[PDB]
Design a protein around this ligand. Structure first.
Ligand SMILES: [Ca+2]
Ligand SMILES: [Ca+2]
Length: 129
């Protein structure tokens, strides 16, 4: 089974802030990206048992539209403009899972806005595929 990492703690934020306005988040809050481009959340301590493909499941809210994020693993961009589709409400928390390669031990994962801003981000769950 997996490990959940909160977006709001254990992370470095760039042009993004922790908030609690919309209910239903896990932990102490969620992250609101503020800039249409170059806002970011970086997890610096994702800790895996093995090297291989991981399921990374984002819990997020997005009232309308699709917003795209670049995704970096260990400093290298591995997904470009990955879509996050609407959930319908800022208090509807949906899920999106990507499959990405990661290493055993401690890894970093960063998600970055690229022109469409971002979903409000609650947490990620990482599971070996
Ligand atoms: Ca925002
Ligand atoms: Ca959270």
């Amino acid at each position: 089974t997996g490990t959940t990492y909160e977006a709001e703690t254990g992370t470095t934020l760039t042009d993004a802030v922790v908030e609690t306005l919309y209910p239903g988040y896990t932990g102490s809050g969620y992250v609101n990206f503020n800039a249409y481009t170059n806002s970011a959340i970086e997890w610096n301590a994702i800790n895996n048992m093995t090297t291989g493909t991981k399921n990374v499941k984002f819990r997020y809210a997005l009232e309308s539209g699709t917003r795209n994020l670049d995704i970096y693993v260990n400093g290298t961009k591995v997904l470009s403009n990955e879509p996050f589709t609407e959930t319908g409400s800022w208090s509807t928390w949906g899920e999106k899972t990507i499959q990405v390669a990661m290493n055993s031990g401690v890894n970093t994962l960063r998600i970055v806005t690229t022109g469409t801003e971002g979903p409000n981000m609650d947490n990620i769950t990482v599971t070996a595929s």
